[model samples]
Target: SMSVKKPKRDDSKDLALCSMILTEMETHEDAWPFLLPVNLKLVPGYKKVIKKPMDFSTIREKLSSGQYPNLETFALDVRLVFDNCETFNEDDSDIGRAGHNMRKYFEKKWTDTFK
Candidate 1:
């Protein structure tokens, strides 16, 4: 007989990190707009895809509602928000730099904060 194994989870910690990122973006308004394109013409379906600007409160509610089955889904949703942005240069765009910094923040604080 074969058996299935469940993966470990951290609902609270994941929610907390999502909240933290939201708060960070909220506090830094200048950087927030860069996450969204200035002109929809540059990126087709921008309006249809991301109807509204990303919000921490909205994401928090979704997270609390169990909309995301796991951390990977949640992470991908967050990444999608970033990935949809217009990047002139992947390595040099302000949004790209901000994302890199955010990932670094998560990596450095995940263990300490979750521990």
Candidate 2:
């Protein structure tokens, strides 16, 4: 019933695929703001109910540890990170545009790459 969902990968390929994506997604421009987690002290009052925190560190470490079962699961966590960005930053300002832009950018790679 949710129109927001994208089709997840059925089976993930080798880590190299995601690794390449990491490199692509980790470029120095729009991704700089998302590479780390938001400060708890900065937005401490705005959206404290963020049940899950998935920074790029979390994703990369899991990649290092082979923690992701499949690309679907991997994508799921990355999706949440952007949502967390949105939760804390409702405006389409810096973090908002950067976050959403990066998310959408990743989506293209994920979709066409998988396709």
Candidate 3:
């Protein structure tokens, strides 16, 4: 019989890091603007499944409620939100740079979580 290997949890380090980032975002007005990408602006939803902003508070609540299976999954969603940016330049705008930095921050933290 073939055996399936289950993924391991990160001893809550990923959760901790996510919490820290969310907390930081809570203090920044610029971070709130990124909400459009994750909100209905980028992906429209149906009546039953309405799209909403990806604000720090919303994500934090989702995280606390176990909406994401793992940090990687959560990070993917975050990246997708940034990927949908239409006004900011990931290389130029301050907000864009901050978003990129947040991406990198999670990338590094996620890598470190495994080690």
Candidate 4:
């Protein structure tokens, strides 16, 4: 006869408490376990396959290449950045404010060019 072992399950309350603590630690750098700056870098050649309406890689490459052909394209990139910022702020962090500010900067420039 073979002996069977049961898998352990996490308690919902304990999981929730752990999640809260992790969130707190992430927000408060001093409480973080690792003393390292989180660096998010785009992988080489990875973003090229990304498309618009979701990826926005075309505009990203355009901006990177300094090929600002028209105001429409620039506006599209600005809107995309704003949208990205919103996604970034799903955790209710500072990313939303940063995105709004970036959008404002571009909008002001766009408005100024009309004058």
Candidate with the larger lDDT of 1 and 3: 3
Task: Output the TM-score of candidate 4.
Answer: 0.40
Q: What stretches of model 2 exceed 4 Å from their correct place? A: 1-12
Per-residue lDDT tens digits of candidate 3, residues 1-115? 2686677654657777777765654565556555433434454442225333344555777889989887767766666555544333446777677677666665665566454
- Residue clash pairs of candidate 1: none
Q: Specify the poorest-scoring 10-residue window by lDDT in model 3.
A: 46-55
Q: Any residue pairs clashing in model 2, and if so which? A: none
List TM-scores for all candidates, in order.
Answer: 0.48, 0.80, 0.54, 0.40
lDDT of 1 by residue, 9-109 (tens): 64656666756755665466445644433466775665566654443454566777878776666656655545544323264767667766655554455
Query: For candidate 2, lDDT tens digit of each residue in 1-115?
Result: 5788777645546577887887787884888777877677786663458888777877889988989987778888889888888987766689888888889888998998786
What does candidate 4's lDDT look like per residue over 1-115, in tens digits? 2586677554334333323432432354222212221223543432343232322344445545657554455566547645644644543555555446555655565565443
Which order, best to worst by lDDT? 2, 3, 1, 4
Model 4: number of clashes?
Answer: 0
Give the lDDT of residue 6 in candidate 2.
78
Q: Write the number of the candidate with greater lDDT, choosing between 1 and 4.
A: 1
Which one wins on lDDT?
A: 2
What's the candidate order when arranged by decreasing TM-score? 2, 3, 1, 4
For candidate 3, the clash count comes to 0
Q: How many clashes in each candidate?
A: 0, 0, 0, 0
Query: With candidate 2 superimposed using the best TM-score fit, by how many Å does residue 2's alpha carbon deviate from the native?
Result: 31
**Segments in model 3 whose C-alpha atoms lie over 4 Å from true places:** 4-17, 24-53, 86-90
Model 2: worst 10 consecutive residues (lDDT sum): 5-14
